[PDB]
């Protein structure tokens, strides 16, 4: 359910949605993305057709983890609109992002 955005598709998928955007950065060699791996993929399922759930390996996507100055993963963003309303860092509880995600629905 969570695809992969890059520099190519950002503007589309992620600036233009109509819908609230979630972007979840990690990276292979990150441990604790295995731990926020299950979290991020239940709340796409769960918010399907009311969020986009979309993931960025900071290693494939350079560039965009220095645009939004991602300095540690994991990392999830909230967008709305083309603007960005939360950056959230680290293992949080899933109860926390959930309750950002609700904020912007």
Known sequence: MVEEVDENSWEEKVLKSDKPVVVYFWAPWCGPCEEIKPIIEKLAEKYAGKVR????????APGIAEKYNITSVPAVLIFKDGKLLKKLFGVIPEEELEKWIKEVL
């Open 53 to 60: 759930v979309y993931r960025v390996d900071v290693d494939k």
